[PDB]
């Protein structure tokens, strides 16, 4: 039993809700919130900009030190950093950005990072400003993640579309 509330159950382990991931994380304080990151951990817009704003830029400060030490992530890769005031940990995961010409096949590799954590609050990877089809992202999530994932969907029209179209 966990403190996630109001989610629709899609499968044994995947749950979905229309919610602002920032407001969700503040309420639940999950062990892990997933950020829709880029390889430079530059949290400018989308989920990343919103999460970083909610940390008063502490996420960006921590991320800049991470990059200075370790260099960029790989597309499809991840790193675990602090969750600041939002969660215990933030799993920064880089899905492919179609608006940069990146290989959508790497979306499965991106979701594989979730399997290293028993429970996560997450957005749909590569959706929104990353330019992939969200129906596809949900399908890859369901077919790749085996741990318990609570998906927050920002856009109500898309939330309704993902449920009604879910197979
Ligand atoms: O796939 C990620 C998703 C993509 C979008 N598509 C249409 C509108 S935003 N973005 C978000 N998802 C959840 N919480 C969020 N807070 C801020 C952004 C955000
Ligand atoms: Cl977005």
Curated annotation (Swiss-Prot):
Q: How is its activity regulated?
A: Inhibited in vitro by GRL-0617.
Q: How does it sit in the membrane?
A: Multi-pass membrane protein
Subunit organization: May form homohexamers. Interacts with N protein.
The reaction(s) catalysed by this protein are: Thiol-dependent hydrolysis of ester, thioester, amide, peptide and isopeptide bonds formed by the C-terminal Gly of ubiquitin (a 76-residue protein attached to proteins as an intracellular targeting signal)
- Protein's recorded name: Papain-like protease nsp3
Q: Which domain of life is it from?
A: Viruses
Q: Mutating residue 164 to L has which effect?
A: In strain: Gamma/P.1
Q: Where in the cell is it found?
A: Host endoplasmic reticulum membrane
Annotated consequence of substituting residue 31 to A: In strain: Mu/B.1.621
Query: What job does the chain carry out?
Result: Responsible for the cleavages located at the N-terminus of the replicase polyprotein. Participates together with nsp4 in the assembly of virally-induced cytoplasmic double-membrane vesicles necessary for viral replication. Antagonizes innate immune induction of type I interferon by blocking the phosphorylation, dimerization and subsequent nuclear translocation of host IRF3. Also prevents host NF-kappa-B signaling. In addition, PL-PRO possesses a deubiquitinating/deISGylating activity and processes both 'Lys-48'- and 'Lys-63'-linked polyubiquitin chains from cellular substrates.
Q: What organism, scientifically named, is this protein from?
A: Severe acute respiratory syndrome coronavirus 2 (2019-nCoV)
Full-sequence range covered: 1025 to 1191 of 7096
Indicate the segments forming the Macro domain, all copies.
Answer: 1-167
